[PDB]
Amino acid sequence: MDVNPTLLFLKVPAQNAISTTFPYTGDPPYSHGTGTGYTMDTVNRTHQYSEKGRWTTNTETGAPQLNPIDGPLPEDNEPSGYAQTDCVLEAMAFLEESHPGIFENSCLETMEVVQQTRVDKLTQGRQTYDWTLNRNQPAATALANTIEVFRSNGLTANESGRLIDFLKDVMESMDKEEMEITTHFQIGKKKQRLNKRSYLIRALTLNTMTKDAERGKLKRRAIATPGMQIRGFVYFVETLARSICEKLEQSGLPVGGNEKKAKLANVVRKMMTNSQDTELSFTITGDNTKWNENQNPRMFLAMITYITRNQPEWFRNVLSIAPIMFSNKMARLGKGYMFESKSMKLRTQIPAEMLASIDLKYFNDSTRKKIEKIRPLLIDGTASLSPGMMMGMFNMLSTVLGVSILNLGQKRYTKTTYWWDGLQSSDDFALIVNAPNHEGIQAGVDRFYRTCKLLGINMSKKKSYINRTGTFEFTSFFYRYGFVANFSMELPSFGVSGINESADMSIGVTVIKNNMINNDLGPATAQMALQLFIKDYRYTYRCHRGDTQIQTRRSFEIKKLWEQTRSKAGLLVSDGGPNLYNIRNLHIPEVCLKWELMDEDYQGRLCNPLNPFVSHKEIESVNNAVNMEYDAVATTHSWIPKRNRSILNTSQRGILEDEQMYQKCCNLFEKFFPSSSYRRPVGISSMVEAMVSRARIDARIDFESGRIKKEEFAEIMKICSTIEELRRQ
Amino acid sequence: MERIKELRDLMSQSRTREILTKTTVDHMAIIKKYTSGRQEKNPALRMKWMMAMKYPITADKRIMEMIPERNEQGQTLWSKTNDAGSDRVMVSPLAVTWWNRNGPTTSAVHYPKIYKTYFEKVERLKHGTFGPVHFRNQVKIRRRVDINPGHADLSAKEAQDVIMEVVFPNEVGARILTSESQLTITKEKKEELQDCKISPLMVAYMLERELVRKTRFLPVAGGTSSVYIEVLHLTQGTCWEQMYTPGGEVRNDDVDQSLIIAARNIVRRATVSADPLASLLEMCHSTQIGGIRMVDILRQNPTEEQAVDICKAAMGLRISSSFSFGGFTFKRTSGSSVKREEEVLTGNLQTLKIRVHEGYEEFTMVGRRATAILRKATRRLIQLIVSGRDEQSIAEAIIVAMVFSQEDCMIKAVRGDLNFVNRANQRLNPMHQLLRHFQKDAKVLFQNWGIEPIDNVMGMIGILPDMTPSTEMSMRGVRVSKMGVDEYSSTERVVVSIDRFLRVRDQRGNVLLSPEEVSETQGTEKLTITYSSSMMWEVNGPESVLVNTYQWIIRNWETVKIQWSQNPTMLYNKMEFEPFQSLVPKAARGQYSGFVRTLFQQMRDVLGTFDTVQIIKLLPFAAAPPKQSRMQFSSLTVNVRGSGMRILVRGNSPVFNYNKATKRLTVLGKDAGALT
Amino acid sequence: EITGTMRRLADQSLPPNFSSLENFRAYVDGFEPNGYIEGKLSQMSKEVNARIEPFLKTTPRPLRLPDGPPCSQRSKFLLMDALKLSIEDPSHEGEGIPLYDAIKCMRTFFGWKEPNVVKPHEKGINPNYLLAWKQVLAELQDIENEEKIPKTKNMKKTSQLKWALGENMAPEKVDFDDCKDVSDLKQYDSDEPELRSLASWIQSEFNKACELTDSSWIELDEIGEDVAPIEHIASMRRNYFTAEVSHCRATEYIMKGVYINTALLNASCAAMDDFQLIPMISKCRTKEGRRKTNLYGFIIKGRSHLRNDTDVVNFVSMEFSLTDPRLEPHKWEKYCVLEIGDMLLRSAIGQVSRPMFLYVRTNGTSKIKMKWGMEMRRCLLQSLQQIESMIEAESSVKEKDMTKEFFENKSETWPIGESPKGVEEGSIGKVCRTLLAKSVFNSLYASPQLEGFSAESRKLLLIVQALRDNLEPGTFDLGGLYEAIEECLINDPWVLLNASWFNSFLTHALR
RNA sequence: GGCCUGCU
RNA sequence: AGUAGAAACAAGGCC
């Protein structure tokens, strides 16, 4: 007998066993070297799918830009980025007709947000390409460097702590005849100048990288990261787009998984049960090929201009700016390329900027073709990527266009027996088309395809299929007359998260409890998940039961603690104690569960505030792990782990001292202002001015009614006067 | 005093002087987040790879003067090397366990107060009482449900200001806490945290957890309570229910909500059954709410609602007096009355007998969203004052009062098909049928009532047929008002009788309750109802009803197969097919039933004919009373979301298809049991 | 206000028939729908369409597999060809010093000979493998002489191990301005992997991975005491699961891989410049009840200066076996095979005296591969979860608990592989072990080809299931889907076997 | 031989 | 040699 697990599908349906078709127990595919090749490939593709457009030379950047809007109509079933402005505007008009008042209310909400939002909100983000160092840097690091360089140049409106003032400064930096940046060497610094075009290409450029740990693809794809200048305008645009998508029953992007399933089920119910039995109904469970490549930012600008009609011109401009920057965006090629000489046994790293000048003898025919094709677009080491968006920066607006296309089948606009509706999240859609016969179904799916090609949205025929209503798939959710649990997407989340010991226990038992609630994980599987998680936890953190003979570097202290203690059921798994977790106790932390069994000496040592291990920085990160909210108790096991410590060998050493002393400063401010941690401080007053004035008021109020007598009040006032004098001088 | 000296020391250095001078307060976050350390894309690999090096964790530098460099075995606990961007020192994990075996001690009494929510969860679970596990299909309906169990009904922004007023009274800003609830919360909470020395940030996050509301879409069946959703991983599964009763003393609002929903559902199911009283009693015994049985709450809890009163009266108990009408609760306050057993005609010329009452009498109307006071005479209204909340509430109260008046102005307004027979072929109460007819719109009752003059006393507002106040001429007897509450609350409980069809009565002979007074509304329980019965799909819906009916008949096929042959009338007259009977045309209920019974009879008569698929398909249609006929049917329609889905008698269908290869039956795309 | 440079950029970011942002804004503000979509649809060519091609039983063709030399073993340790020396020592899973346990497990074998080469590597220097074996033996005897066994032993850096572990093989790093006119200076080799055809040995490895054994391989941690009835139900379910699964070679591979990857990661982090000897240990528990320790061989970790998650640490693996390398030589392309001893097993024809070979090879791993193979126990979750789903899906049907009937009465049977006579069905336990072995092999042979093929064949599986349900399914480009599936079948044994399985499934379905 | 780094 | 597969590792830099 030869064993075949796939034959299991001869008795169990494919959706009730789809977890078997998910190889999510092994290393996900990773990239190894440069990502220049994929960046060039994407540039050449997105310039190929729009080649019948019109060419231009930008007067500001000097880059060759391809405009496919209002271009010729496609003649074959290949991908096309030739979107039609009139059709986009008609889609928006019919969208407003079907949901009246949606754009007005969304614009009002976004105006309120624009008026209220602050610059600190840009600190909550991923890596951002800092244009001052030409390096990916954390969002707060990039914001700080940009703010510093602006203040070094005279654009200090951003000190208002409002996002719109930071955007006014970003826009006013381009009308300057010379930027001023600083570069490190070896350790000191050097001043450098940037003419208008250099700063323009630096503000408009995007960084490129390969995306690691992607499940479900044989070949690697590239992704982009924008700078600080485009992130505020994109924040406002994404705010508007979310606000719109919230009011549409056909959008699916701004909502979670469970409400996504609810929406899908409601739509399927509407199309099956309400409609008569005579009509047929077919579900296309489809995807979109090259979704981002064909999404021109000029049609996002047109959509924004339509949405912001009859509105203050300032709001229209602030929301229009982001598409304007994306239309002129540049893409950094990547890391570069490595050359090996086998006879001489040597290697060499060439940067991507040299590709414009480098001889082409050293490249394989594929790279020779890519470089030769892309060289015209290369301006100062970056390729003009105007013809389309890269990897969904405008995700919510793409979902808005998709919901418009889904809303264009209501049967009031088709004016025919067939109609359609569905749910789309960017790059993936499910379409229920209802019609009286198979010719009507074919005509409805042809009109859907064609109306999708007039907006630059291409349907993947290789990865899409149409069946009867009742069975379909949407974002790895398999609906078969009702939704079905998968549990294979959530399998890599069933181990030690890797924050610390307390957080790992909390996150592991909350992930078990959630998978029990949401993904129909069983009771026995949940108990075994507990057991295996605890085994991994003990092995990873060298914290074994203590009645064992496992020799580790931390196996001696655990036995001394085990032997000191009389009540051994009160010890934490992190200190060498038993496991009291079960199904009933998945919603309780490990410190409160064992609290009544603990000894008072151990109980007071563990939960000691003076411990040198617990540090908490901000209210947002106290019990939140990238997002997994995890209820936990602050104990001595809540340490922070160590840092990369690889900056010591690089040109950038002065950031460590700057950040150590900035943390000093922030701690002193927290001493002066107790609520600097809870509520992010707001104001416009300088550090020393606020600190000295606050201290002065405290001394005055203490003298009037408090401990402070004349001596200490006078001393404080004199010292504060000294601080003010030293500040002014 | 120390802090200002620290500030002089920071200001002394020129570089720190430029950091303090240039940085504005708005940027406090940015420089707090300024760090070279990139966030770990793969934290697991970075804590599995990192936990194999000496000194993998970090700690404050005070550890260097509190813990020794090595233990008795000689293993190092900390190093003199510093973290990358910090003054903190690199230490081994042996510094943690050493701290737990030989470090300083304190008093941890503060922590129970600090982490109140978690200890309340522990106390609620420790005292809970489990019971039998019931293996049954779980209809988990995705719904937004409140996760937090101590939420004081304050939003995150709403409660951040109370948290600040409690912990940080000088940094609150312009926000004045107007609401009294916030003000009581502030005074009470301030006392508990007088000296807490954990951290004011942790005390603020504590008050965030206790006070901040939180909602999450979750697949929920039953439950819906704060204390029953925190254990949703333990109470609810895919095929199993776990009876559970948290430890915390339950609020009685939730309990009475569940009591009314349960009583409504039961009363509705009882109306359509064959013997409503027996079924009602058996179901109330076999059902429980929040763990506690239904009888316990019904004997202990006094609650005013029609279904609860019917349930109580069926248990031979006291029941509140002050008869009700059209869902409203009437209390007479003056006069006698006698019925007359008289006859009259309508505006649509239909003849009818009714019982009109004697004497002048005043009444105190009460309701869910309205209130009124009425004075009338024999067949004649005298005056009506109303106290509704919304305009349609006043309209409801006014039409109810007009119907109660029994005036010919109302009798000569009835127009259309108003048949006084129920789904069960039970003649219906006339009064409720009129009151249901005049609830679509009572336009004809308004243009046919009459007109009188008014003295314009008190500055009272005029009446509205269609939102037209008339301050000098108005409906006759009818007034406009808006009281806060009815005259006074009635609490005098009476003895009653009940017919089989739940027509409650009083000692004199008048009518007191009926299954028509119960609401037509469909609510969502706050506590998990454990309506234990073979049929739990009472309110589930038609698709579930069909699938589960076919599943039941599959599971109990072994005894239905022998009851179908011997004594089949108690199989047709069975308490399991009544939800299916709720479906299937109301007119062709009898024709379909007789058809199917004749099929089964001629299938039993001739030998050599037996198809289990036919019986399992057509049995739910033979439940109804048999109406004879001469025709035949090729399909059978069933109402699903207003659409008539057709079930094919011969062969498979989208509603009923039995695979002959794998022997699985499938209802509506859902498996409904293997067939033998 | 928009002004200056950002106005000009605004004028060059509009459709092509516009020259000013203000004219475009006026056109939009005056735009009113007047039937434009329908018109451009009428102008659009009718060749651009999405005609639905029906999908019937005769429509789907088999998946084509590549042609080429047969595929060779890729795993980091032997799966079915592995051998165990044992001492029967009462020491729990980790309660020992690996090197002392290894010495005890090696002392119990007598029959050692002078090693000689049997199957050469054919690309390497087999005398170096011979010398490396002899060095390992010398160092083990040296450890034996020492009064206290080192917890971690380093190895000498001889030329055989410098070669066998890839030492001073990386090229030197220079500046591009110093190597330009070099003849053979070119880009890294970036070509299609070498093609490889499916072989018969992977199916036999999978057949034996699904087999029972005479020992227990999983001792789980403890949990709280069960207080609710559903906890008792879950505990009985878990006991049945562990009973069925604990006697299975898949769990043995789980433990081997977890131990080996833990040891490799820890040795790599702790000793980065030194070479280190790491015994292959696994502690089972025979059905009688005595616990046993088992040694499969040795690893020799090279240096491990691993920066990126893809950086490679090289090691030399040596494993004992009884399988002759001359019966399936294409399976051992990357292996050198020596002859190391003789063994007399339990025979009824006197004693057999079969020889005993050592499979020696150079291999490598990364931080991520180590991390992901040290967590193969999640496979037990995947499998058992699917099983539990099935059980609960049946318990809802029959209003009663279904663990005992399923696991004991064995009445239910699921097709779980085809015999020459036809499709063969198995009991719930065989299904459990089959899914566990599938997940374990997914973990051992994980590659981007597996991901790609899994997705692209999931799509076809779902289309075939829609066809099986009589839901009149259809497609728009099926040959593209096939070309996307077949694009991932290149050289991986596991992926080619999955493709063969999919072909067999399509053959047995659609009837 | 000694020291710096292990995502920069 | 080996890992690996559209580009990399098989240590890197500073004295």
Short mmCIF file of N, CA and C in Angstrom, two decimals, chain B residues 108-117 119 188-189 192-193 196 206 210:
data_model
loop_
_atom_site.label_atom_id
_atom_site.label_comp_id
_atom_site.label_asym_id
_atom_site.label_seq_id
_atom_site.Cartn_x
_atom_site.Cartn_y
_atom_site.Cartn_z
N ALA B 108 2.94 42.78 49.06
CA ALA B 108 2.23 42.77 47.79
C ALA B 108 0.72 42.90 47.95
N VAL B 109 0.26 43.39 49.10
CA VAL B 109 -1.17 43.63 49.28
C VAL B 109 -1.69 44.64 48.27
N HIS B 110 -0.81 45.53 47.80
CA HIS B 110 -1.23 46.53 46.81
C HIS B 110 -1.70 45.88 45.51
N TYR B 111 -1.05 44.79 45.11
CA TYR B 111 -1.30 44.24 43.78
C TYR B 111 -2.73 43.76 43.58
N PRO B 112 -3.37 43.08 44.54
CA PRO B 112 -4.79 42.74 44.36
C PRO B 112 -5.65 43.96 44.08
N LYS B 113 -5.40 45.07 44.77
CA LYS B 113 -6.13 46.30 44.49
C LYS B 113 -5.81 46.82 43.09
N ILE B 114 -4.54 46.76 42.69
CA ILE B 114 -4.14 47.30 41.40
C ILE B 114 -4.80 46.52 40.27
N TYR B 115 -4.57 45.21 40.23
CA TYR B 115 -5.10 44.36 39.17
C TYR B 115 -6.45 43.78 39.58
N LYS B 116 -7.40 44.68 39.82
CA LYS B 116 -8.71 44.28 40.32
C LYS B 116 -9.46 43.43 39.30
N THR B 117 -9.38 43.78 38.01
CA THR B 117 -10.14 43.06 37.00
C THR B 117 -9.74 41.59 36.96
N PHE B 119 -8.24 39.70 39.26
CA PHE B 119 -8.62 38.98 40.46
C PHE B 119 -10.13 38.78 40.54
N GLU B 188 -15.03 58.02 44.71
CA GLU B 188 -14.85 56.67 45.25
C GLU B 188 -13.48 56.11 44.90
N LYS B 189 -13.04 56.27 43.65
CA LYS B 189 -11.76 55.68 43.25
C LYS B 189 -10.56 56.36 43.91
N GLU B 192 -9.24 54.66 47.28
CA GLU B 192 -8.57 53.36 47.27
C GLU B 192 -7.09 53.49 46.94
N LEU B 193 -6.73 54.41 46.05
CA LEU B 193 -5.37 54.52 45.52
C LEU B 193 -4.56 55.62 46.20
N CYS B 196 -0.75 54.17 46.58
CA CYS B 196 -0.22 53.10 45.75
C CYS B 196 1.14 53.49 45.19
N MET B 206 -4.63 50.76 34.95
CA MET B 206 -5.62 50.03 35.75
C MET B 206 -6.99 50.65 35.57
N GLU B 210 -10.48 49.02 34.03
CA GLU B 210 -11.74 48.94 34.75
C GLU B 210 -12.83 49.78 34.10
#
